[PDB]
Amino acid sequence: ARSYGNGVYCNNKKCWVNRGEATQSIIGGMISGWASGLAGM
């Protein structure tokens, strides 16, 4: 269990790694999800 920010100890069932890095990443992890959400019905 943690609470250093918005996650750290994963979301709940999933498990993300390096938010900022991934975010700032060209690939865009977070974004990919946003688009995945909208596109994902």
C-alpha span between 22 and 28 (Å, rounded)? 6
C-alpha span between 41 and 39 (Å, rounded)? 5
7 in Cβ contact with 20 (< 8 Å): no
9 in Cβ contact with 1 (< 8 Å): yes
∠ CA 23-7-29, nearest 5°, is 20
Separation in Å, CA 13 to CA 5, 25, 26: 17, 24, 26
41 in Cβ contact with 28 (< 8 Å): no
**3-class SS letters over 1-41:** CCCCCCCCCCCCCCCCCCHHHHHHCCCCHHHHHHHHHHHCC
C-alpha span between 31 and 23 (Å, rounded)? 7
What is the domain-level CATH number for residue 21?
Answer: 1.20.5.130
**Structural method:** NMR
Domains held by the chain: number = 1
Where in the sequence is the domain holding 41, given as residue range(s)? 1-41
